[PDB]
Amino acid sequence: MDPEQIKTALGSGLLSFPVTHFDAEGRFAADSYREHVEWLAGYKAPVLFAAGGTGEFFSLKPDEIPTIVAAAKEVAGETAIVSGCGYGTEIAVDIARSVEKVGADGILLLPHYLIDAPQEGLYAHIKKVCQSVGIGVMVYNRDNSVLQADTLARLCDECPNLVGFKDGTGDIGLVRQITAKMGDRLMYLGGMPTAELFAEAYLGAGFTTYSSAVFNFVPGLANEFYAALRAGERATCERILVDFFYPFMAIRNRAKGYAVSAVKAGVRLQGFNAGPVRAPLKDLTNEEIGMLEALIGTHKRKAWSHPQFE
Amino acid sequence: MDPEQIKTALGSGLLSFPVTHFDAEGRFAADSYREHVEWLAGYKAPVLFAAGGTGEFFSLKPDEIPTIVAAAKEVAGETAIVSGCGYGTEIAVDIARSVEKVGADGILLLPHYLIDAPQEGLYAHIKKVCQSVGIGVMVYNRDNSVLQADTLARLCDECPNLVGFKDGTGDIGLVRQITAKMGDRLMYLGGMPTAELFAEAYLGAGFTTYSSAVFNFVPGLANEFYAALRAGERATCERILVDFFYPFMAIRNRAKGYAVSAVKAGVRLQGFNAGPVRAPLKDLTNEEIGMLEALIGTHKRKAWSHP
Amino acid sequence: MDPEQIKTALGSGLLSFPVTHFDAEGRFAADSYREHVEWLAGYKAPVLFAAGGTGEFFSLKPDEIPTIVAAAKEVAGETAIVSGCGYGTEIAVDIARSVEKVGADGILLLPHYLIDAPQEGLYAHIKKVCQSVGIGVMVYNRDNSVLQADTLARLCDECPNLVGFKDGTGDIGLVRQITAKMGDRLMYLGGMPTAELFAEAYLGAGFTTYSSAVFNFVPGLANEFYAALRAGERATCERILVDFFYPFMAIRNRAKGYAVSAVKAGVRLQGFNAGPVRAPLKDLTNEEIGMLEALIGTHKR
Amino acid sequence: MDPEQIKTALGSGLLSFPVTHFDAEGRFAADSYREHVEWLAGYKAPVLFAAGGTGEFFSLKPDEIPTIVAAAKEVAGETAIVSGCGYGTEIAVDIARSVEKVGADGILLLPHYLIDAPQEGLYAHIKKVCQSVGIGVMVYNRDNSVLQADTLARLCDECPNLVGFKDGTGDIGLVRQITAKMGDRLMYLGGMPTAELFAEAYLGAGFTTYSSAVFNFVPGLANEFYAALRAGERATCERILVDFFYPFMAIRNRAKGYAVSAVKAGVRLQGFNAGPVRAPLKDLTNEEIGMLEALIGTHKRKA
């Protein structure tokens, strides 16, 4: 679709970022990925971000990315498919073009690699990536790539296909300035690692959607929180925070990278064997997986038959 | 008043934190302060925080604090008066007791001095301060004193006079967890330096008021923003952010400590003789004062205005 | 003594920062403090910093500080006594004058309270404190008070009694620039938490002494490390780092504030009634105390 | 060469990290690169790191890296050539094998991309990269990849070809612990931005060499500072800090990324056609290039 069409889709509901499934040999496992994506499809997120951060973008070989996007497209139905993109300009442009070729509906541009950069340089980098494709682009303020409002305004003026802004900084002061400056020129996407913890505050900042990483494994719970958020049903949001999210955060905070690793464990627990994380992430221990299983609780989508003899 | 009465007052509108006025010899200028407070009183903030951060608490001798509190109380009218308090436990308790004696309605407890401390030590320190007085206490999460939700819950269960929570961290994740845990047990006060920049977001976090430092010198504009915030008039809030607050931020960001220095400059520009900041703050350059004067623009205090 | 005399003493050996002793009722325990200081004097540190950071300066009432300085002065002999000082300018000046009155040979100026400040403001604050007394002053780069080299040079030109510079930032780039700019105008004092971990690197930066917090309870070992440092005996320094300091660091890193709490625990283990730390610090658990005792081993008194 | 031979070379002098030359269109300019590398070779650094950080590794396509390494090898003479490597494991292994194939003598492993990672994950990633090649590996503690001493010891026990450790953290406390733990098992390389500012302190930490980015454009000055350093000639080191390095640092601190951009400007000022930086770095302004030219001063290579 064209950039205005993906822009519309971004404003039409909750955003899905599926984990990328690997086999025991570490290879992309398309059959498993498709099974999981097809299940998620019944929950009707309007945009699916393949090979995003929750999808371990940062551990994929660039040649894997179009393959993953194409697999998601097979089963995503009437859903917009956005691909992760990133690294320095030369690599990012090659990835962007390769996923445009395989029919992505947009790109989410993760930070360039390693260095701190001046605003003028961020401008030049992001402009070059946006101009390399005709599909829609969402920028992603996080880590070593944080656009100021004036720089983002210049990008918006010179790149019509730049239609979205995702925040991973948690800097309310800055993101409210950005929405004040750009208004409806961009769709504003919450991007903190467990975004429900920020969503009520982010409404005031001007953001009415976000990536729900936990939608990977408790989509019914994530959809309910989202509906409650949009309806102003504070007591419902709060109950779900207290009973699910803060306990999840306690598991997630046990080690670096668990914002991804714990989500992938949840997916496995729900009966999709998404496989291990790639180093340098590490998987949850069997004990920690058990903690997450207990938390999922009434939201389990199956029962397991654990091995036993006599 | 009793802690429940200050608690109620904290929930009744916008919070005022007056700058502390100093004279030529560097001393607290009580006439000028009282004059400024009396003018501010016309703009009807329900709570006045004397000798808070904006009031340069961190540069006051402890014996100056009761003098300043007493001065505000003289001319503040039917307005709750909360005093700054801070430092390590031994100093904080002395300060707290001294301001209770001159009729403070509460204390805002700024961080202890210098060190990083374990949660259980924060708990011990804050508990001792709360237990040293009968008036209401508001804790203040910022810098080297950041309470987690569980620690704060323990304090609330053991110190009935602990009735307010100010945030200066900007950590949305944490403050939402805090309001979810405590609910109406505490009043939640926004406390980022230029808090209007955060107010709309903080509503969703569970906070419906904040310290407006700029109320010191453009109380009308600060009231206009607050009214629009509480009414859900986003376009009005946004106009004021774009036309006044982001330009103010550009000035504030030119040097460390300007969150206080630029406010004091604004007060002097509006004709209240607030004097210099105390070191280690510095005052704005004449160029910067000029920038603030232009920004104040149509909100300039005029000789022909009616009180 | 005059600032040039405290300056010379700062360059004559290892620096001692005794913990401040408190009794059951929570007051300063002068008898206990004096007993501990008198024992430490046997180990011959040329300068003793009373009510510094390790001495819980940040938890003391301003009127306690002269009492502590006076107690140290009673028993320290031919040792220079520097007092902690800090907070904002009005409080700092009052402390500085009060300790000069009871005979402090110098002050160590800890950061002002709470706020981040511009260089021009740090200049104004520090200058006012220096000009309030005749005794020597050491500034202390740490936390919210970090002087750049040009600002410190201005202070040195203006304030003859400013004679020392203590670093607690660990910013090797900055401290080398400072020593290159000022040269022998100042004495350079290492001030990281557990400064032996930094001492060999700090030699190259231009610093040949530091505060040894562990001198509080293993003064002999601290002296052994220092002598090896100055003699260039790397294998000896390294043995002591591996066998004592990194294991100590492992205990210290178990909780915030243990850079002070663990040292105080060590002092109590050597039979001095130093008492508890003041909140918001917390004391070591019994388990942790046991670990420290085992580590101290044959250095037990 | 074998890992022990590259290890010996790392301990034999100063380390050179040439900027990667680009044409106006941003493409690798091999002829200009080789001219500059040949000029630097007269100053006898024992190891040349091609496509390191100063060489804009982070802006190169993986397929460019072997071409740059091969270019350096043409003209570097009897000099060990180490290639940059980095990113996540899948990319890093392919880069490592590609530069081994063009005859690199080692790899310097820059951080993986983007994420914070647990120590056990860093271990697994770095082990897989080390085991993918037979040439020497230097790890690089920087940003989102900071090995603790115990993790590094595990890697050293498992990976005999891991022979060097470069520090970009400035964490003196940690690096001294690492040298105390590993001793002569590793060669210790200073890796801060403008490393001469740290070199005297780093001696005490156990480091006797470092990357000299400014060697790109004032190699005589860099060699003299290094010689004074190893001779214990403090007044000479200090004079060069005061007269050259602190003024350079003032230019460097004007904008993000200038640790690379200012060095590349210096190379251009000395008459080599190094070209622009790639975004998201930016080049110095005309005003700043004038400042640097004035600073180079008596050390100009030509008029």
Measured CA to CA, the distance from residue D89 to residue D91 in angstroms comes to: 6
Contact list, C111 vs chain B (CB under 8 Å): 114
Is the CB of D254 inside 8 Å of chain A's CB atoms? no
Is the CB of A200 inside 8 Å of chain B's CB atoms? yes
Contact state of B113 with C280 under an 8 Å Cβ cutoff: no
Produce one character per residue of B15-26: b if its CB has 16 or more CB atoms within 10 Å, e if not. bbbbbbbbeeee
Contact list, A143 vs chain D (CB under 8 Å): 114
Measured CA to CA, the distance from residue C295 to residue C263 in angstroms comes to: 13
Contact list, D167 vs chain C (CB under 8 Å): none
Resolution rounded to one decimal, in angstroms = 1.5
Distance from CA of C26 to the nearest CA of B (A): 10
Neighbours of C125 (CB within 10 A): 24
Nearest CA in chain D to C207: D201
Top residue of D22, D114, D130, D284 to mutate, by most chain A CBs within 10 Å, is: D114
Measured CA to CA, the distance from residue D204 to residue D206 in angstroms comes to: 5
Of the candidates A173, A177, A200, the beta carbon closest to that of B176 is on A200
Contact state of B280 with C121 under an 8 Å Cβ cutoff: yes
Task: Collect all residues with Cβ–Cβ distance below 8 Å to B290 and sequence separation of at least 6.
Answer: none
> What contacts 24+ positions apart, CB below 8 Å, involve C31-36?
C32/C272, C32/C273, C32/C274, C32/C275, C33/C68, C33/C71, C33/C72, C34/C71, C34/C72, C34/C74, C34/C75, C35/C272, C36/C216, C36/C267, C36/C272, C36/C274
Nearest CA in chain A to B240: A180
| Helix, strand, coil abundance in chain C, percent, nearest 5 | 50, 15, 35
The answer to whether residues D146 and D116 touch, using CB atoms and an 8 Å cutoff, is no
Neighbours of B57 (CB within 10 A): 28
Are chains D and C touching, using the cut-off of 8 Å on CB pairs and a minimum of 3 such pairs? Answer: yes
Neighbours of D63 (CB within 10 A): 12
Task: Collect all residues with Cβ–Cβ distance below 8 Å to A253 and sequence separation of at least 6.
Answer: none
Are chains D and A touching, using the cut-off of 8 Å on CB pairs and a minimum of 3 such pairs? Answer: yes
Interface of A with D in 8-67 (CB under 8 A): 53, 57-62, 64
Of the candidates A172, A202, A241, the beta carbon closest to that of B198 is on A172
User: How far apart, in Å, are the Cα atoms of C205 and each of C2, D55, D284, D300?
Assistant: 27, 29, 31, 30
Q: Counting every residue, how long is chain C?
A: 301
Neighbours of C88 (CB within 10 A): 22
End-to-end CA distance of chain D: 40
Q: State which H helix or E strand residue B82 sits in.
A: strand B80-85
User: Listing from the earlier edge strand, what are the strands of the sheet with D47-50?
Assistant: D15-16, D47-50, D80-85, D106-109, D136-141, D162-167, D187-190, D209-210
Measured CA to CA, the distance from residue A189 to residue A209 in angstroms comes to: 5
User: What subunits touch chain C, counting only 3 or more CB pairs under 8 A?
Assistant: B, D
The answer to whether residues C144 and C116 touch, using CB atoms and an 8 Å cutoff, is yes
Q: Is A254 helix (H, G, I), strand (E, B) or coil?
A: coil
Can you read off the two tokens belonging to residue D286? 């005309």
Measured CA to CA, the distance from residue A192 to residue A205 in angstroms comes to: 14
Which one, of D269, A246, B114, lies nearest residue C92 by Cα? B114
Residue A116: phi and psi, rounded to 5, are: -75, 140
Neighbours of A231 (CB within 10 A): 10
The answer to whether residues A159 and A182 touch, using CB atoms and an 8 Å cutoff, is no
Q: State which H helix or E strand residue A15 sits in.
A: strand A15-16
Measured CA to CA, the distance from residue C40 to residue D189 in angstroms comes to: 41
Of the candidates D113, D117, D280, the beta carbon closest to that of A257 is on D117
Contact state of A257 with D60 under an 8 Å Cβ cutoff: no
Contact state of D201 with C202 under an 8 Å Cβ cutoff: yes
Measured CA to CA, the distance from residue D33 to residue D37 in angstroms comes to: 6
Q: State which H helix or E strand residue A83 sits in.
A: strand A80-85
The answer to whether residues A200 and A234 touch, using CB atoms and an 8 Å cutoff, is yes
Strands (E), chain C: 15-16, 47-50, 80-85, 106-109, 136-141, 162-167, 187-190, 209-210
Look at phi and psi of residue A66 and say left if phi exceeds 0, alpha if psi is from -120 to 50, else beta. alpha
Task: Collect all residues with Cβ–Cβ distance below 8 Å to B166 and sequence separation of at least 6.
Answer: B108, B138, B139, B140, B141, B142, B189, B190, B191, B211
Q: Is C4 helix (H, G, I), strand (E, B) or coil?
A: helix
Contact list, C87 vs chain B (CB under 8 Å): 87, 113
Task: Collect all residues with Cβ–Cβ distance below 8 Å to B105 and sequence separation of at least 6.
Answer: B1, B5, B6, B9, B80, B81, B82, B135, B136
On the CB side of D102, CA atoms within 13 Å amount to: 22
Q: Hey, what amino acid is at B82?
A: V
Measured CA to CA, the distance from residue A40 to residue A75 in angstroms comes to: 10
End-to-end CA distance of chain C: 33
Residue with tokens 């320190």: B125
Which one, of B252, B241, B163, lies nearest residue B201 by Cα? B241
Measured CA to CA, the distance from residue A161 to residue A5 in angstroms comes to: 11
- D76-D82-D83 Cα angle (round to 5): 110
Q: Pairing between strand C15-16 and C47-50?
A: parallel
User: How far apart, in Å, are the Cα atoms of A251 and each of A194, A290, D84?
Assistant: 12, 11, 37
Contact state of A198 with B246 under an 8 Å Cβ cutoff: no
Q: Is C209 helix (H, G, I), strand (E, B) or coil?
A: strand
Which one, of D139, D142, D106, lies nearest residue D125 by Cα? D139
Contact list, D114 vs chain A (CB under 8 Å): 53, 57-58, 86, 110-111, 113, 143
Instruction: Please report the domains of chain B, with CATH numbers, ordered by start residue.
Output: 1-307 (3.20.20.70)
Of the candidates D88, D124, D280, the beta carbon closest to that of A117 is on D280
Measured CA to CA, the distance from residue A31 to residue B45 in angstroms comes to: 63
Can you read off the two tokens belonging to residue D230? 């190893």
Q: State which H helix or E strand residue B139 sits in.
A: strand B136-141
Which one, of B67, B16, B22, lies nearest residue B281 by Cα? B22
Is the CB of D75 inside 8 Å of chain A's CB atoms? no
Contact state of A201 with B197 under an 8 Å Cβ cutoff: no
User: How far apart, in Å, are the Cα atoms of B160 and each of B166, B206, C73?
Assistant: 17, 21, 45
Of the candidates D112, D143, D281, the beta carbon closest to that of A117 is on D281
Can you read off the two tokens belonging to residue B208? 């419906």
Residue with tokens 């860093």: D122
Q: Hey, what amino acid is at A110?
A: L
Contact list, C150 vs chain D (CB under 8 Å): none
Can you read off the two tokens belonging to residue C293? 């005792």
Q: Hey, what amino acid is at B110?
A: L
User: Listing from the earlier edge strand, what are the strands of the sheet with B80-85?
Assistant: B15-16, B47-50, B80-85, B106-109, B136-141, B162-167, B187-190, B209-210
Is the CB of A205 inside 8 Å of chain B's CB atoms? yes
Contact list, A64 vs chain D (CB under 8 Å): 90
Dihedral sign for Cα atoms in the order C28, C34, C37, C39: negative
User: How far apart, in Å, are the Cα atoms of A40 and each of A267, A302, B17, C141, C301?
Assistant: 11, 15, 51, 55, 69
- C122-C124-C128 Cα angle (round to 5): 115
On the CB side of B131, CA atoms within 13 Å amount to: 11
Residue A264: phi and psi, rounded to 5, are: -65, -35
Contact state of B121 with C281 under an 8 Å Cβ cutoff: yes
Cα Rg for chain D, rounded, in angstroms? 18
Q: Is A107 helix (H, G, I), strand (E, B) or coil?
A: strand
Measured CA to CA, the distance from residue D151 to residue A155 in angstroms comes to: 43
Dihedral sign for Cα atoms in the order D188, C180, C169, B262: negative
Measured CA to CA, the distance from residue C249 to residue D180 in angstroms comes to: 14
Can you read off the two tokens belonging to residue D90? 């899948």
Tell me the β-bridge partners of A166. Answer: A140, A189
CB-count burial class (<10 Å; 0-12, 13-18, 19+) for D43: middle
Q: Pairing between strand C106-109 and C80-85?
A: parallel
Cis geometry, peptide bond prior to residue A280 (ω within 30 degrees of 0): yes
Measured CA to CA, the distance from residue D32 to residue B232 in angstroms comes to: 63
The three-state DSSP-derived secondary structure of B149-205 is HHHHHHHHHHCCCEEEEEECCCCHHHHHHHHHHHHHHCEEEECCCCHHHCHHHHHHH
Of the candidates B173, B181, B197, the beta carbon closest to that of A176 is on B197
Residue with tokens 């969503």: A199
Helix axes B149-158, B119-131, angle to 10 degrees: 30
Dihedral sign for Cα atoms in the order B274, B279, B280, B282: positive
Are chains A and C touching, using the cut-off of 8 Å on CB pairs and a minimum of 3 such pairs? Answer: no
On the CB side of A48, CA atoms within 13 Å amount to: 31
Is the CB of D86 inside 8 Å of chain A's CB atoms? yes
The answer to whether residues B74 and B34 touch, using CB atoms and an 8 Å cutoff, is yes
User: Listing from the earlier edge strand, what are the strands of the sheet with A47-50?
Assistant: A15-16, A47-50, A80-85, A106-109, A136-141, A162-167, A187-190, A209-210
Task: Collect all residues with Cβ–Cβ distance below 8 Å to A193 and sequence separation of at least 6.
Answer: A168, A213, A252, A259
Produce one character per residue of B282-295: b if its CB has 16 or more CB atoms within 10 Å, e if not. bbbeeebbebbeeb
Nearest CA in chain A to B229: A204
Tell me the β-bridge partners of D189. Answer: D166, D209
User: How far apart, in Å, are the Cα atoms of A160 and each of A83, A102, A156, C24?
Assistant: 18, 22, 6, 72
Cα Rg for chain C, rounded, in angstroms? 18
The answer to whether residues D167 and D152 touch, using CB atoms and an 8 Å cutoff, is no
Tell me the β-bridge partners of B136. Answer: B106
DSSP label at residue B12: S
Can you read off the two tokens belonging to residue B44? 């009807």
Q: Is C270 helix (H, G, I), strand (E, B) or coil?
A: coil
Can you read off the two tokens belonging to residue C1? 């003594």
Can you read off the two tokens belonging to residue D242? 């005061």
Measured CA to CA, the distance from residue A10 to residue A208 in angstroms comes to: 10
Contact list, C241 vs chain D (CB under 8 Å): 176-177, 180
Is the CB of D278 inside 8 Å of chain A's CB atoms? yes
B181 CA to centre of own chain: 24
Which one, of B101, B87, B182, lies nearest residue B134 by Cα? B101
Distance from CA of C115 to the nearest CA of B (A): 7
Residue C140: phi and psi, rounded to 5, are: -145, 105
Task: Collect all residues with Cβ–Cβ distance below 8 Å to A4 and sequence separation of at least 6.
Answer: A136, A163
CB-count burial class (<10 Å; 0-12, 13-18, 19+) for B226: buried
Experimental technique for the deposited model: X-ray
Task: Collect all residues with Cβ–Cβ distance below 8 Å to B82 and sequence separation of at least 6.
Answer: B6, B47, B48, B49, B50, B52, B104, B105, B106, B107, B108, B136, B138
User: How far apart, in Å, are the Cα atoms of B234 and each of A150, A204, B225, B239, B240?
Assistant: 21, 9, 10, 8, 10
Residue with tokens 């505490």: B186
C7 CA to centre of own chain: 15
Can you read off the two tokens belonging to residue D159? 């990976």
The three-state DSSP-derived secondary structure of chain D is CCHHHHHHHHCCCCEECCCCCECCCCCECHHHHHHHHHHHHCCCCCEEEECCCCCCHHHCCHHHHHHHHHHHHHHCCCCEEEEEECCCHHHHHHHHHHHHHCCCCEEEECCCCCCCCCHHHHHHHHHHHHHCCCCEEEEEEECCECCCHHHHHHHHHHCCCEEEEEECCCCHHHHHHHHHHHHHHCEEEECCCCHHHCHHHHHHHCCCEEECHHHHCCHHHHHHHHHHHHHCCHHHHHHHHHHHHHHHHHHHCCCCCHHHHHHHHHHHHCCCCCCCCCCCCCCCCHHHHHHHHHHHHHHCCCC
Measured CA to CA, the distance from residue A109 to residue A126 in angstroms comes to: 8
* Full DSSP string of A25-80: TS-B-HHHHHHHHHHHHTT--SEEEETSTTTTGGGS-GGGHHHHHHHHHHH--S-E
Contact list, C124 vs chain B (CB under 8 Å): 279-280, 282
Dihedral angle, C-alpha D211, D215, D221, D222, nearest 10 °: 10
Q: Hey, what amino acid is at A179?
A: T
User: What subunits touch chain D, counting only 3 or more CB pairs under 8 A?
Assistant: A, C
Can you read off the two tokens belonging to residue A42? 């019944």
Measured CA to CA, the distance from residue A285 to residue D118 in angstroms comes to: 13
Contact state of B58 with C120 under an 8 Å Cβ cutoff: no
Task: Collect all residues with Cβ–Cβ distance below 8 Å to A281 and sequence separation of at least 6.
Answer: A56, A59, A257, A260, A261, D115, D117, D118, D121
Contact state of B177 with A246 under an 8 Å Cβ cutoff: yes
Measured CA to CA, the distance from residue A246 to residue B181 in angstroms comes to: 11
Contact list, D253 vs chain A (CB under 8 Å): none
Contact list, A116 vs chain D (CB under 8 Å): 256-257
Of the candidates B197, B204, B246, the beta carbon closest to that of A201 is on B204
Measured CA to CA, the distance from residue A243 to residue B219 in angstroms comes to: 42
User: How far apart, in Å, are the Cα atoms of C145 and each of A270, C114, C117, C129, C167?
Assistant: 53, 10, 7, 14, 11
- B176-B177-B180 Cα angle (round to 5): 85
Task: Collect all residues with Cβ–Cβ distance below 8 Å to A213 and sequence separation of at least 6.
Answer: A17, A54, A193, A194, A195, A259, A260, A263
Q: Hey, what amino acid is at C72?
A: A
The answer to whether residues A145 and A111 touch, using CB atoms and an 8 Å cutoff, is yes
The answer to whether residues D29 and D273 touch, using CB atoms and an 8 Å cutoff, is yes
* Full DSSP string of C120-175: HHHHHHHHHHHTT-SSEEEEEEBTTB---HHHHHHHHHH-TTEEEEEE-S--HHHH
> What contacts 24+ positions apart, CB below 8 Å, involve D99-104?
D99/D65, D99/D66, D99/D69, D100/D133, D100/D134, D100/D135, D101/D66, D102/D66, D102/D69, D102/D70, D102/D73, D103/D69, D103/D70, D103/D73, D104/D50, D104/D69, D104/D135
Neighbours of D44 (CB within 10 A): 15
Contact list, D110 vs chain A (CB under 8 Å): 114
Is the CB of B120 inside 8 Å of chain C's CB atoms? yes
Q: State which H helix or E strand residue A106 sits in.
A: strand A106-109
Nearest CA in chain A to D95: A61
Of the candidates A172, A181, A197, the beta carbon closest to that of B201 is on A172
Measured CA to CA, the distance from residue C249 to residue C262 in angstroms comes to: 10
- D138-D139-D140 Cα angle (round to 5): 120
Q: Is C94 helix (H, G, I), strand (E, B) or coil?
A: helix
Is the CB of A258 inside 8 Å of chain B's CB atoms? no
Q: Counting every residue, how long is chain B?
A: 307
Interface of D with C in 143-182 (CB under 8 A): 170-173, 176-177, 180-181
